[PDB]
Amino acid sequence: KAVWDWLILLLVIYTAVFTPYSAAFLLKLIGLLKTARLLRLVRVARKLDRYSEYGAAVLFLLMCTFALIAHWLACIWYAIGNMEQPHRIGWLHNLGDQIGKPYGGPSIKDKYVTALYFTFSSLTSVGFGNVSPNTNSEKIFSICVMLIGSLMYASIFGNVSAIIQR
Amino acid sequence: KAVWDWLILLLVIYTAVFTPYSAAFLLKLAVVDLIVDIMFIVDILINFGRIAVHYFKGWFLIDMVAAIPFDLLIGLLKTARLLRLVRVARKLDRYSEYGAAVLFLLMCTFALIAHWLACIWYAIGNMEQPHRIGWLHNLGDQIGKPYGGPSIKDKYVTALYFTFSSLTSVGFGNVSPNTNSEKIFSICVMLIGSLMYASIFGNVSAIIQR
Amino acid sequence: KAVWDWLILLLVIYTAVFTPYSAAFLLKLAVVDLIVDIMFIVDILINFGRIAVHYFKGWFLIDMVAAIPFDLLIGLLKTARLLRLVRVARKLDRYSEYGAAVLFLLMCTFALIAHWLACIWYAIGNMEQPHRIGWLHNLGDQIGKPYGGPSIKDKYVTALYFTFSSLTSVGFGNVSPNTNSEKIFSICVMLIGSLMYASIFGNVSAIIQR
Amino acid sequence: KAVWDWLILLLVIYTAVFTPYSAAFLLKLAVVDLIVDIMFIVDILINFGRIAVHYFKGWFLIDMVAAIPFDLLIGLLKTARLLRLVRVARKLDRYSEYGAAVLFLLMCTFALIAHWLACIWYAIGNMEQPHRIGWLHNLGDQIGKPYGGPSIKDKYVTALYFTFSSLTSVGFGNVSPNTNSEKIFSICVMLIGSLMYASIFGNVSAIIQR
Ligand SMILES: O=c1[nH]c2ccccc2n1C1CCN(CCCC(c2ccc(F)cc2)c2ccc(F)cc2)CC1
Known part of the structure; x- marks a missing residue:
């Protein structure tokens, strides 16, 4: 036990x-x-009382939940980009053009890696310019991502900056 | 009451x-x-x-x-x-009785300043429209609607998206100021967004621990 | 007196x-x-x-x-x-008594550092101008004033906008260093910003806490 | 001694x-x-x-x-x-008394992490050239030296500049990952940059008060 x-x-x-x-x-x-x-x-x-014994455990859990929300946002981003695809607009067409695999199209590995990379760059507020929202649904999703990303960035990294002394 | x-x-x-x-x-x-x-x-x-x-x-x-x-x-x-x-x-004391209320008020005013700056950005872009340099022309080309141009929905969404990206300091590169007025307004928006993040999320960090 | x-x-x-x-x-x-x-x-x-x-x-x-x-x-x-x-x-005793004075001094020193970096950026971009890779060539190509060249106002606004975007961690992608000297200056700006942005905005957050 | x-x-x-x-x-x-x-x-x-x-x-x-x-x-x-x-x-006691040598050490380890990440970035990029995809091909195109391609100085400066931009969360858009290896490396760089920002510059904000 x-x-x-x-x-x-x-x-x-x-x-x-x-x-x-x-x-x-x-x-x-x-x-x-x-x-x-x-x-x-x-x-x-509900098992936080037992999990929070060590500060390094809290840091690992915070990194894990940040990566998990990034993965969920990547899945939502891919779903949004996949609904629009069979209807040079949209991130999937641009990704297929960029890696030299015109839409067939990019493999599942490439699509997932691109989605996760875009989501991480947006949440960490880097914005590499390789992947950029270009449709109304993508732009609204991006706006929501940056809103909740400011919120979660502040909360998570303020918790980290408080714990690091401990 | x-x-x-x-x-x-x-x-x-x-x-x-x-x-x-x-x-x-x-x-x-x-x-x-x-x-x-x-x-x-x-x-x-x-x-x-x-x-x-x-x-x-x-x-x-x-x-x-x-x-x-x-x-x-x-x-x-x-x-x-x-x-x-x-x-x-005037009655901010009544609203500051709960931490969640203060958090929601901070988020609401951040979104409100983003909306106001989006309206100012669209006004700046429109005042120079009848003079491929402005952001409206680029938006038209990118969305596949070259200048009736983009609809009101597309223009508002693009302005809000650019303003949010600038305030949050992402800078997606899809929308970039190109005229002097746009550049000066973008400088002001960068300063405003830096102040927003600093003050609001310092307050957020203060609330979350308690 | x-x-x-x-x-x-x-x-x-x-x-x-x-x-x-x-x-x-x-x-x-x-x-x-x-x-x-x-x-x-x-x-x-x-x-x-x-x-x-x-x-x-x-x-x-x-x-x-x-x-x-x-x-x-x-x-x-x-x-x-x-x-x-x-x-x-040397006279910091008098100017460090009003909190609003301290905030105004911090804002002015942010603006002054950005202005100095913009001046250095323009000096770098112009010393290599007569030698299609520099930022001045791209600026002229994108605002409709191909090299002639842009006006002094356009050059100053572009330099200040690039410097502010670099210091504020936005990186709009409109102006991007494409030369060895420009890249080295951008790295130096990145380091100076990492120090100065953090210090000044931590101080500003401290004043806001008051 | x-x-x-x-x-x-x-x-x-x-x-x-x-x-x-x-x-x-x-x-x-x-x-x-x-x-x-x-x-x-x-x-x-x-x-x-x-x-x-x-x-x-x-x-x-x-x-x-x-x-x-x-x-x-x-x-x-x-x-x-x-x-x-x-x-x-193992001799951190000797290097923790000046009160500014430790700040210099924090800046030095910032630069060292950036330089090591630049070395790993170039190691990833060079192994893919034998196999217009890749940051080295784009670098050659931009600086006007199409792939013999860019010199060692240009490659090192570009790698260090990209790594600094990624860690500092600017994302200039001049250098952008395009392959799966580059994308995964950039994801890791962003994560470690955020964490290192938090930790190291919380320490820096604490230290600058003295
Ligand atoms: O406001 C926001 N909304 C957001 C919404 C979503 C996500 C993030 C959001 N954010 C913030 C993200 C963090 N970012 C400061 C990083 C400091 C950085 C630096 C460096 C140089 C510089 F000049 C300025 C700033 C730095 C990086 C690494 C370091 F080690 C040290 C300092 C400010 C914007």
Whole structure:
């Protein structure tokens, strides 16, 4: 029971990683109900008293949730860009043109890596200029991403800057 | 009375959102603003026999100038309705009773400044439009709608997106100032956004720990 | 005498703004220059009869060096007028009592550092101009003034906008370094910004906490 | 002995700068490297009859590993000199008293992390040229030296400039990752840059108050 909770947290991280990714990339309709597995995060929400023993554990958890929200935003971004694609506008067409794989199109690995890279650059406020929103849906998604990204950036990194002394 | 002032705050936020938009993007329904101004007249009637002179000596004039209809550049006089923000500024103690309320107020004012700067950005872009240098021409080309050009929705979304990116210090590169007026306004927006982040999110860090 | 210090501070701000700008751009009004020189001569005269010996060893040499005209490129020696900053540097006791004064000083030093970096950026971009890779060629190509070339106003606004975007961590992508000297200067600007942005905005957050 | 400690710190900085640069770029002078090796041999000799037992069972293994010549890939095997950083990491007491030497050390480790990331970035980029995709091809196109391509100076300056921009969250848009390896490396660089910003410059904000 002492080490059961760490394994439970690792498996909940696994399922919270691989449910949105599958539901956003691998469909290419009753299987959509599998998205309800995300409710398992309440276990790690309620086990904070046991998880927060060490400050390095809190830093690892903060990095993990930042990466997790980046992954979820990447999945949403790919879903948005995939809905518009079969209807040179949109990020998927530009990505296919850039890597020399005209839309066929880029492989799933390339699309996921591009989406995660764009989401990380937006959340960290770098904006490399390689990937830029170009449609109304993409622009509104970007606006929401920067809003909640300012919020989560402030909260997460203020917590980190408070803990680092400890 | 608390519910009344919270509803007053909601209506103040509504008019602050909808006045600059109608000033800039419109003038190329009215039932909502008619209801809002009628309800604000009801509020000023509530705010006023012994305390009427005290209120008249205090904040009566500021509300009065912001409550007189301008029905008779001619249509631009409605920008004076933005003065109602001090109605919320004067009673900030009531709103600062909870940490969540302060957090929501900070986010709301950040979005409100972004909206106001978006309206100013569109006004700057439009005043130079009839003179491929401005941002409106680039927007038209990128969206595949070369200059009727982009619609009102596309133009507002692009202005808000550029303003949010500049304030948050992302700089996506899709929209970049190209004329001197755009460059100066962008410098001002960068300073405003730096101040926004510093002050607001220092306050946010202060609240979250408690 | 009571208000002489703030007038001297304003004069120092003026010369700090207009000496690097003149040296970097206008080398290829004199009345205000003469007025400023006469005002500084008056200041050094009244700064002084048993205390003259104390000043002779204290700060007279620096003020005398910064006050002597160099007219006999003779204009490059006029950069010595930038030495007047020690007058406000040493008098920090008076200027650090009002919190609003401290905030205004921080804003002015941010703007001054950005202006100096813009002047250095233009000097770098112009020293390599006669040698399609520099930022001046791209600026001329993108604003519709192909090299001729852009006006002085356009060049200054572009340089200041690039410097502000670099210091504020926006990086708009309109102006991007494309030469070894430009890239090295951009790295130096990145380091100086990492220090100065953090320090100044931490101080500003501290004042806001008050 | 303090002079010896500071000289050893300077030599540690030198080797941490020049062995990864050599490994990344110069593969496919030596007098200074030989002098530094002899100096570190002198240092490990100095590190030593009652005290030799403590050193032999203490830090002698790491120092011996970092001091044994590998002149029998040798160019890649010379990287084993990077373990000399423990020699400064284990004497942090001596380098924490000036109150500004530690700030200089923070700036130096900023520059060192940026330089190492630049070396890794160039190592990633150069391995893909045999296989207009890649940052080296774009660099060649931009600076007007199409792929023989850019010189070693241009490649190093571009790599360091991109790494600094990524860490400092500017993203100038001149250099942008395009391959999966470049994108993943950039993701990692952004993450470590954010974390290092938080930690290191929280420490810097704490230190600048004194
Ligand atoms: O405001 C925001 N809204 C946002 C919304 C979403 C996401 C982020 C948002 N953000 C902030 C993100 C962090 N960013 C400051 C980084 C300091 C940086 C630096 C460097 C040089 C410089 F000149 C200025 C700033 C630096 C980086 C690494 C370091 F090690 C040290 C300092 C300010 C914008």
